[PDB]
Amino acid sequence: MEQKNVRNFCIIAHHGKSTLADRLLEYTGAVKMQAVRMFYKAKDGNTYKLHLIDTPGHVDFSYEVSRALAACEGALLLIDASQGIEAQTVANFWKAVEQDLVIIPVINKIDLPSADVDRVKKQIEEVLGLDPEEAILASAKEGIGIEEILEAIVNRIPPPKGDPQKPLKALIFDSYYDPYRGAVAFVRIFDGEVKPGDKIMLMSTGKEYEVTEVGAQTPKMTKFDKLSAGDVGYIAASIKDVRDIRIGDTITHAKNPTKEPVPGFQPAKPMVYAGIYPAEDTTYEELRDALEKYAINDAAIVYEPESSPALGMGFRVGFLGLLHMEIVQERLEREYGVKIITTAPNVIYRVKKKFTDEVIEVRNPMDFPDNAGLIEYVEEPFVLVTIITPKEYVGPIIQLCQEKRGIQKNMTYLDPNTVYLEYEMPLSEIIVDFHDKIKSISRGFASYDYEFIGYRPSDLIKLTVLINKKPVDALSFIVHADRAQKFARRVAEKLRETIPRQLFEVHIQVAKGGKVIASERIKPLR
Known part of the structure; x- marks a missing residue:
């Protein structure tokens, strides 16, 4: 198996991404799915080593999508036959272009009555500037397009370029925490080779480790004797946590380091924060314990203790965005069974x-x-x-x-x-x-x-929320001066419906630097 017979690709889509990966594996063969190695004998008679790199879709994980793209030579751009091109479709397209990838447009769900292939082809040409003729038609239920897809990968995506003799240079594009193997890095090898026993170094930190295991998913996590230029797989090296092998970082050899790291490294960047407090029966200790365990599998999340006079003790947590927040919330409640209330x-x-x-x-x-x-x-x-x-x-x-x-x-x-x-x-x-x-x-x-x-x-100002003439810190928010009145009314009306009724009247007030600009009341429990 030579490097010229290797094909490194990823699937880009909001539009049945997981399904396609399954069809691809079943056709060839028959821990999250990542760095999957497949073998495929093409029509030309030759057998090819194909590496499938899984990518996230949401804008919250934009940086991670780009790093995964930088690890491939090509991408399958999935477009629904009915919906046609979407905003994410265009955005991902450009990121693929940005990483000089060969893009293979795949129109699936061709079976649906709502499907309109001709329209989508038209969009592919006018909007993406691609050749509608090179688009591949797929249909899961009808079972078509796979062989054509695999053939396109072999014939259209160029093989990886890199020298197995040059100093090691591996890009980390994903990771996860393994209770037995420790923090595992999913990597793309550009130059050199890496094998168990090797002393590696992380270029952004200069931290060194001794490799314990290397391999790829086949689809099971399988250990190989090594990984060489062009390969995609994983590396374990008694690494303490996923923050030591940050996505986008470069792995090289400690003694014989590559000249420069793969360009584009950026530490995780939280963008949206919210306060998370224990709810119902859940205590602070349980919430904290839950956050600590979760964090082991999330290299981007940040959090610190905070307190409110009404809500008590909780945490100010930083997320990459709204979906990331949603993901953390559902996993805390689902995985650790903790009840939480989240601020705006x-x-x-x-x-x-x-x-x-x-x-x-x-x-x-x-x-x-x-x-x-x-x-x-x-x-x-x-x-x-x-x-x-x-x-x-x-x-x-x-x-x-x-x-x-x-x-x-x-x-x-x-x-x-x-x-x-x-x-x-x-x-x-x-x-x-x-x-x-x-x-x-x-x-x-x-x-x-x-x-x-x-x-x-x-022109931004802080608005405070008072319940019974006394303010509640956790409900204070920042708004544009012109939108203050409107946000104030909305927030007040929301609370009048949110909080239950008590024996006494519940007066809700939204103040702007001392003065009240929104009022709402909840008559006594009756």
């Missing part, structure tokens, strides 16, 4: 106060200065939002983005009935209810994606 999420604000030289990073609203007079300026993160929707919903969506302080930067037609929109919007407005709103007004037909584009100064 918030972004990281940068505040410049009068008597403090350095700008302060606020990840907890209650840490935002109470004294507005002391604030010289506040900046918040903005993102570029791309949206794809049927023409019928364009107006309602535009109005929505506009209400959320969005600035339109572009509008284009992806076909006579499909519109593409680009909007610069504050991330703070996006994490409130944008997702459910855009989905309801589009009947689930509109899609969107976004990219961080930097911080910008804004």
